[PDB]
C-alpha cells in the first residue's frame, strides 16, 4: 500500500507516535517519506545480506527475522514479512523499540539527512488526524 501523507499521519497518531520519546508526529511522517515514499512494500537489499523492510525500512540484521540474513538478531520478535503489510501496527511497534533501544531516531539515515534540521510540522500540514 502507498499511504497518502495525511493518511499515514493519522494512522501514526492513532498508534501513539506523536511525541513518542520526544519526537513529534511530523518526525515519523518525514522519516517515512524519505525512507520509503510511504510504500509499505518498500525493500532495500543491502550488500551485507540484510534487507530493510517496509514504510520505515527496518533492517533484518537486528530487528526482524527474514530467514536469510547471516549473523542476525530479531529484537522485535517478528518475521520481516509483517513489515510489508498494509496495516502499519507491527511496523510502529518495532519503530518504538528502535527509538527506545537507540536513545533516538538516528537509526534512520534518511531522517538524519532530510528531516532533523527542518520544521517537521510541515509534514502534518492539512492533515485530519
Residue numbers in the entry: 1 to 129
What did the article's authors report about this structure?
When lysozyme from duck eggs was first analyzed, it was noted that the most striking differences between the enzymes from ducks and chickens, apart from ducks having multiple isoforms, were the complete absence of any histidine residues in the duck variants (which at one stage was incorrectly suspected of being a requisite for catalysis) and the increased amounts of arginine relative to the chicken counterpart. DEL-I and DEL-II also bound HyHEL10 with a similar affinity, which represented at least a three orders-of-magnitude decrease compared with HEL. In contrast, binding of HyHEL10 was essentially eliminated altogether in the case of DEL-III. Additionally, as indicated by our binding data, one of the duck isoforms, DEL-III, failed to bind HyHEL10 with any substantial affinity.
We have solved the crystal structures of two of the three isoforms of lysozyme purified from Pekin duck eggs (DEL-I and DEL-III). The duck egg lysozyme structures have the basic fold of the C-type lysozyme characteristic of HEL. In general, the duck isoforms contain approximately 20 amino-acid substitutions (of 129 positions) relative to the chicken enzyme, and were thus considered to be likely to maintain essentially the same fold.
